Amino acid sequence: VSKAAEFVISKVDDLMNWARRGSIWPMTFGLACCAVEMMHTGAARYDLDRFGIIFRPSPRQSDCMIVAGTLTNKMAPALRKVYDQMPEPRWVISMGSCANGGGYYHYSYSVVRGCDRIVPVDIYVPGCPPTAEALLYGLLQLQKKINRRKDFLHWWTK
Amino acid sequence: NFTSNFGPAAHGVLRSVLEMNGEVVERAEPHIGLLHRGTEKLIEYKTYLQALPYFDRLDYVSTMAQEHAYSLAVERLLNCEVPLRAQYIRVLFCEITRILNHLLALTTHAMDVGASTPSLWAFEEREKLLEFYERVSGARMHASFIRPGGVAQDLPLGLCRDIDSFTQQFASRIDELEEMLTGNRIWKQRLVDIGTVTAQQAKDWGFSGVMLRGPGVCWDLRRAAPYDVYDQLDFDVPVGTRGDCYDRYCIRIEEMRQSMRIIWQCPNKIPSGMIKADDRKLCPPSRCRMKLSMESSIHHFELYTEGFSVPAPSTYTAVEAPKGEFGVFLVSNGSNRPYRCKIRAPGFAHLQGLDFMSKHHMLADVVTIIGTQDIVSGEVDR
Amino acid sequence: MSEFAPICIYLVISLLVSLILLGLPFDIRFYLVSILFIIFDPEVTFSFPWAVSLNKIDPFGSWSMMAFLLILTIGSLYEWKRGALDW
Amino acid sequence: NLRWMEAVLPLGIIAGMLCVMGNAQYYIHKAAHGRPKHIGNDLWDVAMERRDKKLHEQAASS
Amino acid sequence: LRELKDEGYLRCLPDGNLLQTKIHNIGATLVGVDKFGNKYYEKLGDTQYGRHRWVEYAEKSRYNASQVPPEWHGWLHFITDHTGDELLLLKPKRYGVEHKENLSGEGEQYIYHSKGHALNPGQRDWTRYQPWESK
Amino acid sequence: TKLEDEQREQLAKEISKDWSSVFERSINTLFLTEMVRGLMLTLKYFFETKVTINYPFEKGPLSPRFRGEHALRRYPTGEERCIACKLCEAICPAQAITIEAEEREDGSRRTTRYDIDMTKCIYCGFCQEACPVDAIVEGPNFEFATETHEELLYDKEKLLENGDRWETEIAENLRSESLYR
Amino acid sequence: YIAVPAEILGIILPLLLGVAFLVLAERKVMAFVQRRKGPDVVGSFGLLQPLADGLKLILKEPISPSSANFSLFRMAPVATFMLSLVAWAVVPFDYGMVLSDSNIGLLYLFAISSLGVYGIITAGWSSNSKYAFLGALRSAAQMVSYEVSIGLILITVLICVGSCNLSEIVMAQKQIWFGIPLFPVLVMFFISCLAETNRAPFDLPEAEAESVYSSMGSALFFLGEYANMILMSGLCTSLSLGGWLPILDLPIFKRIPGSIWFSIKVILFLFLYIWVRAAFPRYRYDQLMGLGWKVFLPLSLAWVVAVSGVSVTFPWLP
Ligand code: SF4
Ligand code: SF4
Ligand code: SF4
């Protein structure tokens, strides 16, 4: 395995993952009241920019998509078209309780039972609306996921 | 005439389409179905005590005035009086909710126009008030705390002292914010004379709340039809002289200050007593009685299985929400499920407003108009 | 001269570094504003030599330059009252 | 109490860079010709530099 | 020197947060230490209302929330100013499960599943009848 | 628009009474005193302290009346509390509970399956009010942010039973709410 | 022969380091203004934030555009970059600590600003959609109007002192800072520098483009904008605040290397940029161009006339 080269590969993966986790750039999708709470996360109390996180509006240069709210049969195509227009490394955080699993209006027409059907959600979150602490902990869970992302090793073995 | 689109801060989800001409909005038209849920259908296939959270979800900024309106509707239809301490704490929290909504709408307007520091300071204050919520009952937002006939749980000890501390520091904070925005020539030149509305077309397009009170006509439901303790709580009710963005803004700040006056008048008169009922047939019994007496258990069981039954008639009930005349139309008949509960959020009136009052302006002024209207697509569509 | 040689070497080196950075990841309103600029830009052009040499010219220089400014200022006033710079 | 110093600090780096930036070329030129740059060389000083250089080389060779 | 500097001090240089917590510590006092090794401090005084009780996780590299046990979770979220040692004097007996942070990402077996999910070694079957099943 | 011409005249004839007034207003709008005042306020806030709760080390304030990750308590004897009244399922406004019981062998009644697909369970609170034995409760834990929907479909009472890992903390809350609830 | 490329590299690289840390400090100090901390996780004090953002934008999967895919789209960002830097060529950091003593420096800076206008307009039109083209036209008009105002202000500061090369100007200030007597001129020049790069209160072009594309292309464009920002700050402090000259002229200040003074002044002006950004709402476009063509042109012209007058009646004019 050239144990030295495997160590260099491990360090390269560490650097790459550290950069990608410390410069993460979300993309809001503020359908319903969770948007409010998400703003409270981006507010002064549980600051988000402190973790190197900037709500970039244009979906051509963002990394995550935060589906915060409640999908709708009228809104699904727009969400899918926005998701497609992102670069390769992507992640999806499903805020709220109806962006994941239908939630309340789950038992109602004109509502998509959870955004999992449209985009491949990565980490959801619980809440109604999730306490700003819960959303920030969700993003830190996303950091913990992207942190076990040995990638250069995969290319060196592929 | 160009045909531009507008699908945007996070000021809700809305699809504006604009017949344009140079930099003039010859005709703006919103597409609004973009967040629909079937709240009325659900309420019907649901109940009273089970459908209260729906009203909590409508107009998700002002998260308690809605429950207050629904509770007033059920009580009116039911003839169930409510004790004085319940009324007083209910008004206290309705006014805290008004302050919440005003902070959010005002400073999000400031962000749309370009400022950011007012947004962050207002959001700190909103954090304080949401902490009050989640201490009294439930989560930060969406506290299902105002049931038919009073409140759910009594409030803790020390909450009044914290209320007073917040009252003082918050007078100071409003003063800071007003010094930061009111008078800045940029803000003045960006806001004034943008979206004039004569009272004739105001009453025609059926505005309510600050909007209707912006241009001239002085009419709010708290003074006209004083549903609750509001009499003993004298206040001011400001009124604007030339209906436009700047005057609606000043109205909003004066409404904040009057809400502070009310929020202080309550903890000086709050009559320590019982809460929420005197019949364990419309309000469930507390835990000690439920687990010690016998008929208390019967009534708790029946009341959490089938709820209370309200009689045949149908009613309309209006409340001065932070936005406007939040209306509820109940057509209940016999059985415990509300036949055809219809909502009358002011979002419809305010969007048709946008349509007519957004002519012969520029796109920055369209954004300004949305700001001053303080729309919540949640309640405009439900 | 012999300073525009450092200038142009700077130009080519900046070209090189910019290309390196690039390759790593692998109506009447407008027209009248432009005209007013073309008219007021030779104003700056003429004010530049007039600026340096206000010591080998007595008040004659100041007055000639003020007369030029007055003619172009009446031009600006006619521009203004016509509202061409209204936007 | 020095919480403000957390904000100037990044800005402060800029200062460093700028200073460094300047100084770099300065000392570079100081080693490329033997004396610091001269601001505003009219033709007189260029002729004098050429003549001085030629004279000193003549003296050194001799 | 270098011992503790490598233990829980030098990680701050590329970790950031640990530097802020070290500053809050030089201002701090001590109020508790929990079996996961982590230290709960309280710098009560003229500081503020939101930030005067906090915790150093005693896992310097991979520190994650929910590592706090329930008692200290309460004391840390201000719900009740009863110290972890007191709530652990309470500590219901005759049953109980030791704490375990929300793994949720370290393989499905450290993660868990329902009774019908294929990755669960149980994999129940939901039929609500029986077949005839002759010999 | 004829009146506007008339109104703009009087409004100018009113503020321009004397010379001191016009001079003051002119250098007021010409030296940006309101701009300077805004800038000074901003700079004060800059020098002032911050809020920035610094989450992963000092979390925010809560209240014993909080709602979060559910749990099923049990008596001090280790005996389960739930008795399958179906009251929580009946009052569920989101129908996010499924519960199916059977007479046990020893005689008492208990729940064979009890699950709450946490998503569809908006966190409203009615659970902890319908229960006549305080079986189900909402412990003050909000950090559970799994990466697969199935988890948030909390399992058939099993994980819900594991809510007893908070049994001390939860207990505290309940005591402080026995008085006024 | 080889010293010149060394000097050019030593001018280019530190500028990029400084501009990365500039955007970092921008976020940090706006945060502190708004009662919050900025990026404080990645680095020891957030110092490793710009490096992390750069590495992310590098490893990010690129997307090549579909509009004149060579020699007109992959060139214009490089054009504006080259223009900003070649402006950075002639700036004095100390006595003789320059790159080129171009004896007409001021005209040079003015010309380079206009060429930056060319850069932005061609970068706007090189795209496909037309709303970006309208935005490009708007930005061009704004930039050129405030350039003519900057020109008149330059003419004032030039009248106050004979020659044009910047070292001579900073000596003239070595007597007494020109910011002191011409304080309103400094305020006008600063507002015009704000409008010239669209930064603090004048953003409606960019705001509308954000209201309605390559990763490295956008990175190059933002880099050019912020570099031009630092340049404008630098020449403002090089011709209106002293330019490496100690205050009060006491021989304890003379131990400071002089170069430090220039850095302190330019960092102060950068802080003022970021500060005035986070205190004020934005103008519209109408009012923006109206102020450009009604409020700053006449004031600047009147100031030229007034300073020429006051300095031609008395024997105070060199
Ligand atoms: S509880 Fe869910 S559906 Fe309701 S406003 Fe919140 S995110 Fe939306
Ligand atoms: S009400 Fe209580 S015990 Fe009764 S069925 Fe539900 S949680 Fe189970
Ligand atoms: S908390 Fe409410 S939504 Fe969840 S199951 Fe219990 S009663 Fe229903």
Side-chain angles (χ1 to χ4, degrees), chain E residues 21-41:
Chain E
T21 294
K22 285 313 182 192
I23 299 175
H24 210 193
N25 278 16
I26 191 175
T29 67
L30 202 153
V31 72
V33 48
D34 175 60
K35 61 209 295 295
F36 290 70
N38 45 30
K39 301 176 171 49
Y40 303 79
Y41 295 161

Side-chain angles (χ1 to χ4, degrees), chain A residues 31-32 67 69-77 79 95-118, chain B residues 33-42 54 57-58 378 381-382, chain F residues 119-120 122:
Chain A
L31 297 159
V67 175
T70 288
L71 256 288
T72 318
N73 287 325
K74 203 175 186 181
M75 194 51 165
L79 162 68
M95 209 172 164
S97 164
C98 306
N100 58 333
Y104 203 53
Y105 321 103
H106 173 261
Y107 265 144
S108 157
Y109 72 92
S110 180
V111 163
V112 167
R113 293 96 165 97
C115 87
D116 162 84
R117 291 186 179 182
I118 308 306
Chain B
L34 283 152
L35 185 136
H36 189 211
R37 285 89 66 95
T39 306
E40 302 170 356
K41 197 69 171 167
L42 281 178
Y54 283 97
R57 305 287 184 263
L58 311 189
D381 189 307
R382 78 275 185 193
Chain F
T119 78
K120 198 192 288 161
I122 72 160

Side-chain angles (χ1 to χ4, degrees), chain F residues 81-89 99 114 130-133 135-136:
Chain F
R81 287 237 199 188
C82 173
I83 47 177
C85 332
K86 310 300 198 66
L87 281 200
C88 66
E89 174 200 21
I99 181 170
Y114 186 99
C131 192
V133 291
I136 190 167

Side-chain angles (χ1 to χ4, degrees), chain G:
Chain G
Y1 154 72
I2 199 62
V4 169
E7 297 151 289
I8 309 289
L9 215 50
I11 278 185
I12 299 313
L13 304 183
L15 172 70
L16 291 177
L17 269 300
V19 71
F21 281 108
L22 157 76
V23 55
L24 162 64
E26 192 274 340
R27 265 192 286 153
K28 275 292 287 297
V29 68
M30 179 155 52
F32 274 181
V33 153
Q34 306 185 257
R35 284 183 74 201
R36 66 166 194 171
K37 302 181 188 306
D40 203 19
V41 165
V42 281
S44 89
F45 273 133
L47 264 55
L48 298 199
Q49 172 74 19
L51 177 146
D53 282 288
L55 297 193
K56 152 171 152 49
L57 283 197
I58 285 185
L59 318 172
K60 180 61 85 165
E61 194 267 7
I63 41 185
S64 165
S66 178
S67 300
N69 315 336
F70 196 88
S71 198
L72 215 50
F73 209 102
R74 314 313 289 169
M75 200 55 168
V78 173
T80 201
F81 204 89
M82 181 168 329
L83 294 163
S84 316
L85 275 64
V86 67
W88 253 122
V90 54
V91 163
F93 302 105
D94 194 301
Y95 205 108
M97 193 173 303
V98 309
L99 170 68
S100 71
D101 197 348
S102 201
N103 205 12
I104 52 189
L106 275 183
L107 297 161
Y108 189 13
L109 266 43
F110 189 53
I112 295 311
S113 316
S114 299
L115 304 197
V117 163
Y118 272 145
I120 188 175
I121 176 174
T122 191
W125 173 66
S126 181
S127 158
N128 196 16
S129 42
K130 69 185 307 179
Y131 308 108
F133 166 52
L134 276 295
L137 294 165
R138 280 178 166 187
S139 277
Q142 160 190 334
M143 286 182 66
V144 62
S145 293
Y146 290 91
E147 282 187 357
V148 66
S149 163
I150 293 177
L152 293 196
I153 303 304
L154 290 177
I155 296 288
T156 294
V157 180
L158 179 56
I159 289 176
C160 292
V161 52
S163 169
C164 297
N165 63 328
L166 292 194
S167 308
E168 186 65 26
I169 287 183
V170 310
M171 313 319 289
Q173 308 204 335
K174 176 261 290 179
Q175 165 51 69
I176 172 64
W177 292 8
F178 289 157
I180 302 314
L182 315 180
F183 198 100
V185 174
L186 171 59
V187 168
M188 267 172 301
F189 181 75
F190 182 83
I191 308 306
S192 278
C193 291
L194 262 182
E196 199 47 77
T197 61
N198 325 312
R199 188 51 200 268
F202 319 111
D203 189 278
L204 208 55
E206 180 65 28
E208 273 294 80
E210 281 207 310
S211 278
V212 175
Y213 313 96
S214 158
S215 44
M216 206 52 55
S218 157
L220 210 62
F221 206 89
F222 280 154
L223 210 45
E225 165 179 329
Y226 281 88
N228 201 324
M229 187 174 300
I230 289 193
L231 162 69
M232 281 300 166
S233 197
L235 78 90
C236 174
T237 180
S238 178
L239 67 91
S240 284
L241 270 192
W244 51 270
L245 285 154
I247 60 174
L248 299 201
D249 187 1
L250 197 167
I252 182 58
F253 294 83
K254 314 193 159 253
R255 185 56 166 178
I256 292 178
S259 175
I260 284 290
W261 292 104
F262 185 81
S263 44
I264 281 186
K265 303 173 197 313
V266 62
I267 188 176
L268 187 144
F269 259 89
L270 288 177
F271 169 54
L272 174 53
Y273 263 175
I274 316 187
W275 171 16
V276 65
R277 164 157 163 84
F280 298 141
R282 327 196 210 99
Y283 269 113
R284 294 190 314 191
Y285 192 66
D286 182 21
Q287 326 175 25
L288 171 44
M289 303 312 299
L291 258 54
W293 282 116
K294 288 190 176 69
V295 194
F296 293 106
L297 170 66
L299 266 191
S300 44
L301 190 48
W303 260 105
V304 166
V305 163
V307 62
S308 67
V310 186
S311 201
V312 80
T313 73
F314 312 137
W316 300 355
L317 176 40

Side-chain angles (χ1 to χ4, degrees), chain B residues 84-362:
Chain B
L84 293 183
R85 177 177 187 85
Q87 290 174 4
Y88 263 84
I89 66 185
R90 206 160 73 180
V91 160
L92 197 151
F93 274 91
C94 173
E95 302 304 326
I96 284 176
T97 296
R98 163 180 324 282
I99 281 180
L100 270 191
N101 183 309
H102 272 275
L103 270 300
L104 177 53
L106 192 60
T107 39
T108 297
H109 190 198
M111 169 159 296
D112 301 309
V113 176
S116 318
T117 73
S119 175
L120 285 182
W121 310 340
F123 276 131
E124 166 65 19
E125 303 306 329
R126 278 183 52 81
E127 296 294 340
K128 288 187 195 315
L129 287 173
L130 292 174
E131 188 274 304
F132 281 169
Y133 271 5
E134 75 89 9
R135 177 197 297 185
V136 157
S137 170
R140 302 152 62 86
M141 306 196 309
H142 299 276
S144 279
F145 181 66
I146 299 182
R147 281 86 184 278
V151 302
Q153 298 181 347
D154 194 306
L155 51 84
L157 287 83
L159 187 86
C160 287
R161 219 176 310 110
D162 298 9
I163 280 287
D164 282 291
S165 294
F166 166 71
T167 291
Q168 296 160 354
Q169 74 90 0
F170 180 63
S172 199
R173 297 292 81 71
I174 288 175
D175 206 319
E176 257 160 21
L177 158 67
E178 191 171 12
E179 193 269 4
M180 188 58 168
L181 262 61
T182 307
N184 205 321
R185 53 171 56 78
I186 318 299
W187 178 267
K188 202 168 299 180
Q189 204 172 22
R190 184 64 175 282
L191 216 58
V192 74
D193 208 318
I194 299 283
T196 44
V197 52
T198 165
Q200 172 50 41
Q201 67 196 5
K203 295 153 55 185
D204 271 4
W205 293 95
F207 290 166
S208 314
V210 48
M211 295 292 311
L212 190 142
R213 257 174 302 142
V217 61
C218 44
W219 179 85
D220 58 20
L221 297 173
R222 308 181 300 184
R223 299 277 94 163
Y227 38 82
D228 201 358
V229 76
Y230 277 163
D231 317 323
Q232 289 84 326
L233 298 191
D234 69 328
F235 40 75
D236 217 28
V237 182
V239 156
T241 170
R242 177 179 307 211
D244 66 357
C245 277
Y246 195 86
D247 281 287
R248 293 184 213 95
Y249 157 94
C250 311
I251 285 293
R252 289 208 149 95
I253 288 174
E254 299 303 324
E255 281 208 319
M256 274 193 206
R257 287 176 208 269
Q258 303 331 297
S259 173
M260 286 181 62
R261 281 175 94 251
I262 302 176
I263 290 179
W264 180 83
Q265 277 193 342
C266 289
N268 189 29
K269 288 180 185 170
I270 171 172
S272 87
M274 67 187 319
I275 60 187
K276 93 193 289 184
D278 208 1
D279 45 352
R280 309 313 181 184
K281 199 160 297 193
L282 309 183
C283 280
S286 64
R287 281 315 190 79
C288 320
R289 266 75 62 193
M290 187 269 291
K291 294 188 285 185
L292 208 166
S293 156
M294 167 55 186
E295 316 151 6
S296 315
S297 180
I298 290 284
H299 287 300
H300 167 94
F301 190 81
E302 200 73 20
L303 192 45
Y304 270 93
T305 39
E306 84 160 326
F308 40 80
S309 317
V310 309
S314 50
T315 173
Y316 184 101
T317 319
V319 157
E320 176 79 19
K323 273 95 176 191
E325 178 178 354
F326 183 76
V328 168
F329 185 73
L330 276 187
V331 192
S332 89
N333 67 316
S335 55
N336 45 315
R337 317 220 305 272
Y339 204 98
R340 192 50 168 97
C341 166
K342 155 79 167 184
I343 315 296
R344 192 252 170 259
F348 277 166
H350 294 43
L351 277 177
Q352 299 178 294
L354 162 66
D355 173 28
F356 88 87
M357 74 205 276
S358 167
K359 303 182 70 62
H360 295 169
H361 290 105
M362 316 166 67

Side-chain angles (χ1 to χ4, degrees), chain F:
Chain F
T1 184
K2 183 204 320 203
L3 191 64
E4 277 55 32
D5 303 83
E6 292 182 353
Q7 285 194 6
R8 200 207 306 165
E9 293 298 19
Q10 176 193 346
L11 185 51
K13 297 274 199 58
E14 163 175 326
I15 59 184
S16 78
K17 272 193 169 186
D18 59 52
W19 189 265
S20 158
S21 159
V22 56
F23 178 68
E24 196 290 328
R25 179 178 299 265
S26 195
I27 62 173
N28 179 352
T29 176
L30 209 72
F31 267 78
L32 312 185
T33 177
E34 50 260 24
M35 297 304 195
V36 173
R37 294 158 90 263
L39 290 196
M40 296 299 172
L41 174 68
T42 290
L43 175 140
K44 178 259 278 187
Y45 264 145
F46 166 80
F47 277 172
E48 187 146 300
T49 178
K50 308 303 176 297
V51 185
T52 305
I53 204 167
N54 186 23
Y55 164 66
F57 285 137
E58 42 183 0
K59 321 197 182 183
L62 272 304
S63 178
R65 288 166 160 178
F66 194 59
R67 313 205 279 245
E69 193 190 316
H70 301 281
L72 296 206
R73 320 173 53 235
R74 36 175 156 188
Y75 288 94
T77 82
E79 166 53 75
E80 196 180 348
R81 287 237 199 188
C82 173
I83 47 177
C85 332
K86 310 300 198 66
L87 281 200
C88 66
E89 174 200 21
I91 201 56
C92 191
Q95 296 194 23
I97 282 176
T98 318
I99 181 170
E100 161 195 331
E102 172 202 340
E103 158 197 12
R104 201 152 64 185
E105 309 101 2
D106 75 331
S108 171
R109 64 185 280 169
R110 287 303 188 274
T111 47
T112 296
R113 164 178 51 169
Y114 186 99
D115 44 16
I116 318 177
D117 55 337
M118 198 53 53
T119 78
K120 198 192 288 161
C121 167
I122 72 160
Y123 314 96
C124 88
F126 294 171
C127 267
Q128 44 175 27
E129 290 174 16
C131 192
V133 291
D134 309 65
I136 190 167
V137 76
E138 293 219 29
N141 171 48
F142 47 81
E143 284 98 328
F144 55 110
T146 173
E147 318 175 7
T148 39
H149 192 277
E150 281 68 20
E151 281 73 344
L152 284 179
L153 202 151
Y154 276 179
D155 307 338
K156 311 161 173 157
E157 175 194 7
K158 191 51 171 303
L159 183 50
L160 279 189
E161 193 66 24
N162 281 2
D164 62 358
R165 90 175 78 252
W166 283 276
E167 174 56 36
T168 174
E169 169 75 5
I170 290 182
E172 187 42 53
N173 299 8
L174 262 66
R175 271 174 290 176
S176 281
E177 303 320 301
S178 87
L179 275 304
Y180 41 98
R181 175 190 296 179

